């Protein structure tokens, strides 16, 4: 469960938010054009995904 | 239970129903940092200079 | 929009050198914050023709009636608001410019003047870690809120009242007290009462432990923050169709903290 | 794996984008204040988290 | 991106200033050591220090602090510098100057009448000695930027309570005021930003300063 | 900053109505767009002051 | 279509630089831009696409 008292917990919350922010930014490009949906790109998109659900899993959503 | 909650135009709401948020923000002159500080010992101390000699 | 915007930054740090040697450099961070208007407080009411025109007029008392409960939750929300700051860590990324949110707490005593020096050794603690942050020289710009039992308790101290120690301060008989380790005393009736709700919304809930809280520091413009959209208005239409009037009063705004480094709350314990 | 060029895609994409920004201004207040860290507040977010790794396994990122 | 050169700016120079009065501060720390020399020795002599006791009674705590600067006061009366206790200065931390106001004898009016008053956080003298009130004093034992000199330990840090002659103690030798550049580097894509000084803090006569430790603090 | 937004919207519809007839209401929609820079082009060329004197 | 097709974002327009670098006795000249382009509306336009070329 998710908590917020102390440094520990602070940290792992600070963590989410800029692995989440990361992600943010690519689903609006996958869906509003057809320019940057090269197959190299959608590596990167995975790759942040993967590292959000970590993150996740760290800060015991 | 007004009569028009089914079919609002919602402007900076998309999705299938208007529930996202895609508002903007609006920012001004704000800067926080520190606070300030100034010396007080500058007088209570005997002084000698010797910058170019 | 119902958004508004607030940057932050960090500090530098200090090095030596010697003849042959270069210089070195570091880097310097940022953040931001936000805040979000979500709820309106209205209030109305409606009359028929035919009443209208067989009473007495009395729609100015129920005009001046209406203000009221809006500056009653106004200065709630204030000082709820106020209350709830002192629980924040501050993140790493900023920690020699940022500091923590700080609370003390008080022990309950049967007798009334152990229980105020207690309140008054709080308050102390306080005043020190404030002035430990650089912001001593500024003390004639904060503010100290009490609830009246605060208010009566502080005056049952042996000093701050006593001609040998704080002349020209206070009287007891009189129920009058002026100052507390350099800051102003005001006294304040908006303290919540219970644990409950509040219709302004879902983040001015208040629980047992919050209502404890019933002294507070804080600097008067450093601190809060209000976003408004909409100013308290009114307005009177009579609706043709249906034979009757009504009147509304509305407003749109809201309250957020900016720095909760600038002020502390003071909690009593283990009460009856 | 990720797939574009297709209804069935962008249907799912969409909903995967939008699943995101739902959590996305959550998080920001998770830590930048101490006026939103009530008990009850954080349960929207778990379910909002809930729901967006459930969008992420339908759409296969 | 906004333009932030002017926050940076100012911040250069609070941090100048908070170096200064630390540097400034840990110089008296240090002179409590000093020995004189042998052949200087009749009319030098050495730095002292003294020691308080902690204790869970706030009250008792002031006494023996208050006592600790007594003794001080008493060896400067010995060496013929009684007749000028109104050039000393007292510098004490925070701590320290909220645990006097708590002695129920600076501050009541039927002794020493005219100093102090409780409500409005206010003390005038100790001793004979005027009081100020500093918030620099190293919090941690470490380096400092000024040089192997400056260097602090566990036990400097635990003296709270310093008095000195401004005029006979310390001396400032400077080579360069403090200055700014700026200035593009074209064969690079940067732009940079530079503050510099030249200067020391030494002693002249130790023998003019003491000192009070804390012992046993939790 | 280093990026841009330019919003998208919907249409409307007709009808018609006989006397006595009320008057439906429609939803608009709504969406966004936005782009970013990211990299630099250029082009250089160094001389020497000894060829450039000559 | 010229006018709804494409959309152009721009930090820096193209602008140079030239300056000695005294220490190495030599002389540079640089130009620079930063920008960028996207889609705006992909409605207003097609493509022939050539097949089974040898």
């Known amino acids: 469960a998710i908590t917020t008292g102390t440094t520990e917990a602070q940290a792992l919350n600070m963590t989410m938010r800029d692995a989440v922010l990361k992600v943010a930014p690519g689903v609006q490009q996958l869906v509003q054009n057809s320019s940057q949906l090269t197959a190299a790109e959608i590596a990167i998109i995975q790759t942040n995904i993967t590292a959000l659900k970590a993150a996740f899993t760290a800060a015991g959503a | 239970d007004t009569p028009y909650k089914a079919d609002l135009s919602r402007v900076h709401w998309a999705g299938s129903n208007s529930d996202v948020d895609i508002h903007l923000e609006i920012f001004e002159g704000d800067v926080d940092s520190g606070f300030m500080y100034n010396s007080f010992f500058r007088g209570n101390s005997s002084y000698v200079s010797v910058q170019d000699q | ?272």
């Open chain 3, 1 to 272: 929009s119902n958004q508004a915007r607030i940057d932050r930054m960090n500090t530098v740090t200090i090095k030596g050198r010697t003849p042959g040697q270069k210089l070195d450099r570091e880097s310097v961070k940022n953040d931001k914050l936000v805040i979000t208007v979500d709820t309106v407080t209205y209030a109305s009411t409606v009359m028929d023709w035919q009443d209208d025109w067989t009473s007495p007029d009395r729609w100015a008392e129920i005009g001046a009636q209406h203000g009221y409960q809006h500056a009653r939750l106004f200065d709630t929300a204030h000082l709820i608001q106020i209350i709830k700051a002192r629980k924040w860590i501050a993140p790493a990324d900023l920690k020699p410019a940022f500091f923590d949110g700080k609370e003390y707490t008080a022990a309950y005593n049967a007798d009334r003047e152990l229980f105020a020096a207690n309140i008054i050794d709080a308050h102390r603690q306080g005043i020190e870690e404030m002035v430990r942050r650089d912001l001593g020289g500024s003390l004639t710009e904060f503010i100290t809120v009490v609830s009246p039992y605060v208010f009566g308790l502080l005056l049952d101290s042996k000093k701050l009242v006593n001609v040998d120690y704080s002349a020209g301060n206070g009287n007891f008989a009189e129920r009058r007290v002026g100052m507390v380790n350099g800051v102003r005393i005001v006294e304040s009736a908006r303290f919540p009462a219970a644990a409950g709700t509040s219709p302004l919304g879902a983040a001015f809930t208040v629980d047992a432990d919050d209502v404890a809280c019933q002294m507070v520091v804080y600097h008067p413009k450093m601190t809060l923050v209000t976003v408004e959209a909409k100013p308290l208005a009114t307005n009177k239409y009579p609706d043709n169709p249906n034979f009757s009037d009504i009147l509304d009063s509305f407003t749109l705004y809201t309250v957020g903290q900016r720095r909760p480094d600038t002020s502390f709350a003071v909690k009593l314990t283990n009460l009856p």
